[PDB]
Amino acid sequence: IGASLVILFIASRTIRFPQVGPKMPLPFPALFNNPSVGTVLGSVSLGHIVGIGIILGLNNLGILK
Amino acid sequence: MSISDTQVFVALVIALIPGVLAFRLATELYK
């Protein structure tokens, strides 16, 4: 479920300090609760990817219910 | 079951990595 996606996303983005390149947190900002936006779209999309890997790891059986 | 020339193999993994690694770790301390 998308929950885990946003969880790992913000875990990688906002609850911590990434050294991500030039550390830019405001290429272009947005608002959900208190974000630093401009790269969050890419972070979210790889979040999609890691969730995809998790779920087809879970493929056999798991949290579907 | 048991093994073959693969034991010559497992011998071959030695005498380069562990051998001269231990050799250097020995000779570091100036005989």
Add this chain to the structure above:
Amino acid sequence: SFEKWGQPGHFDRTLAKGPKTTTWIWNLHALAHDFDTHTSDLEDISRKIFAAHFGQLAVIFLWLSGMEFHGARFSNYEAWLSDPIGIKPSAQVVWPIVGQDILNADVGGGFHGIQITSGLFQVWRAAGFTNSFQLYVTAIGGLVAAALMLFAGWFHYHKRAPKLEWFQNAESMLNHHLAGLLGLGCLSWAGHQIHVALPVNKLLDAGVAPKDIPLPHEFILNNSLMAELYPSFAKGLTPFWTLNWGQYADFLTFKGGLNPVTGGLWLTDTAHHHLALAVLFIVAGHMYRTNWGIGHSIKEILENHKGPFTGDGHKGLYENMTTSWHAQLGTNLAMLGSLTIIVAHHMYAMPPYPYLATDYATALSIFTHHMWIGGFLIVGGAAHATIFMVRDYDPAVNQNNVLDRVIRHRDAIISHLNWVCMFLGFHSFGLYIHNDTMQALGRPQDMFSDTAIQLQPVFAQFVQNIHTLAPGSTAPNALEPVSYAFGGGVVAVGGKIAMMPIALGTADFMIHHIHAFQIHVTVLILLKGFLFARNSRLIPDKANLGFRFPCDGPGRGGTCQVSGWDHVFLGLFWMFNTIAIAVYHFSWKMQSDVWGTIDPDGTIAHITGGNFAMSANTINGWLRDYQWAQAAQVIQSYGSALSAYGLLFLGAHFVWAFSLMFLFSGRGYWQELIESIVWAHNKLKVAPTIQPRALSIIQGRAVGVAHYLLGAIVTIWAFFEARIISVG
């Protein structure tokens, strides 16, 4: 606007004045493109390169569309459609006049012409091509796109030409190309495949009325027939919305082997292949830093990798990769060459088109063609590397770098290299002639095959073995081995082999070793010219004087042939040898123990009969048991309707000897003969005003080597073309 062409020498100030002697003609065809030799500016250079690229693409489109058009109106495709076995494709029908009338290549169904060998119909057995009118439209589209992008080049040079910072964004370059070009094109082609290709492939199993088979418009929004097969392909069930992909086991599968109903592999694997590649290097090509303040600062990566033996690592390399052009040229050429030859070395064990292993004519033609191009251009890559060395460098930005660290200890490198080459060279060839002598000396027990003194390449055998049983454990979700030359069952169709496991006995050893030998000496020559390009132990003015010059006088004895492109001359001779014996080996093995006919028992009766274990060990056998077969028909292969093409093999020898004439001789002799003929002509008042002058020695060397190569390659292609015609 036409007042401008007939003003020759428009790009050079020297040869623009007038043609004093014939020399003025020659240089006209020599400096027409190196416009780096015209100014110091760069934007002009880049614009010229863009326009030239557009022109090359235009001629590409032109020739491909024209070849199509010939395939539509003068090729027996749509008759060969229903039967790809009992009919041999053809094109280029012969014009009925004196001289070319008996050459009617009749391939059944009365269709005369020329029995071609380029396997485009094979693509046209996968693209599912029914009627030639759609193909007519295809050619029209190709040619109009050609003209279109040519007009685009004209515009982008004469009206709106790009600026200079538009050059060196290699980051966006890689991103755009890697992702957008490759991934989008590949996924689009895969989408075309699944929609049309495999449907008509299904429909090519039992004679399902090809033209009667519906058109793609009958499947754009008509999902009913698309729901006939692949129940999950109702619409798609669109379970990707639900992240579930188990339904799609219908078409998007993984078989990995030969499909004995198509003459090629299972196309579904290729489709899923293309999908995976597409997304894989899409997410790859999304790497580098660009306009959003996120990414690798790539000029700092190479700064980091240094250490004790490194010196200072890869510091200072981008000035070379962007300020200069010949660098990029050379490296990309080398890489393309290698890639091409592995392609050649690749697609004879995994045929990716329908009716490939069952068609024993197009295979080696494609193989040898690509293989020749590979080397023939990697040497050019090395040449442009050398031309970079002489044209572009810097004493300042090249302190102790991994580059400079070799140019300081070149002598040890090249000495040890020479050592290796000598070793391998005689260690192989003298061994060979030793066995030759022994066989000629009634001492057969001193031979070296299995029936005599032993040597066995266990490494190849063991790697092939560990490849044989790969699926299940290493490849659980995989059905058959990747190929069948390593291991598996002998896959075939009809009385005609498709692929059997290949055997490596004793003869493989020295063959591979002499391959390595010649590659070593080739590298030796080329790298030697590379390092000893600017300064030799005797000539400290090379780069101070150029890289295209004949000699430096009879000082120190002789010094002729001390430039670099003569090094690449010798190198191209050697690579000729390499690739020639390579294609010899490949053809002989894959006609000796891989190809032939088959019986109902799967009994492979090969063409020759396994001649390597018998004669491919001594020299006299190598001429006997190869060219006896490779010519015994070409002598008489002329003299009837589908034979009249008296081949220019008889003709190529002449150009070969005429070639070698240019090499052995100087020029002053020809100059004096010229002066005598001039005396005579002047006596009869016919003296040509433009005074003829003999060729320059470098010019003569060039024409000699050109004619040499031409004659040799013409000879050999004639050889095996007629040889395959004798069996295909």
Add this chain to the structure above:
Amino acid sequence: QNYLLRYLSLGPVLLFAWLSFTAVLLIVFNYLYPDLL
């Protein structure tokens, strides 16, 4: 204008022109009466 020949008369293009003219010349006599020996 008619200046094109000023820039079409180069020799080489004129070579092939004359040679092809002579070639089709040789053809037509070999095309019309190749039956006189």
Add this chain to the structure above:
Amino acid sequence: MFSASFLPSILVPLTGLVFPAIAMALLLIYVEREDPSGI
């Protein structure tokens, strides 16, 4: 015996005898070295 080769037949003596021999020989000549170098 088993699936291995002869090796356990003759690889003990050199380790048993000759390697100790060179060991002690080198050692003895080491314990008499001159100054100030020594190997």
Add this chain to the structure above:
Amino acid sequence: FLFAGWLHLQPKFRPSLSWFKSAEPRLNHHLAGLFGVSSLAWTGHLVHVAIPESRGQHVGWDNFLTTLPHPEGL
């Protein structure tokens, strides 16, 4: 591990005497991250490999990725 021992002999890899005197980091790292996590890993090897082999089921280095410790698992 031998090579690791060798590396710290090189000059740029010489730890500090204060780096030796500071105890509490070594304390925590050992009494938590030396065996606590290590006994956790041993427990994982137990429920993933040891108990199955006790119960007769073979779980190699590849089948462990797809099969479960418990049907009520997770």
Add this chain to the structure above:
Amino acid sequence: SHSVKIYDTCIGCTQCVRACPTDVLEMVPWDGCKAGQIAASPRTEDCVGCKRCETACPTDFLSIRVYLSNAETTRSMGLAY
């Protein structure tokens, strides 16, 4: 080493003296033409056989020649080893 040969056609442009990398030439005082100083070879022993010099001589039938002898040595052969 080898022998050098001088003539009268030396105009005196002195392109040869700037071309020989072997220091075997000098313009000794002359009187005949506007040259007043004609080239000559004082230090033949370092001759190399490159003969880049007469290629720098513009005079019709270039004024200098080199008679390439037979008494070669390590100097005339030019070896660093």
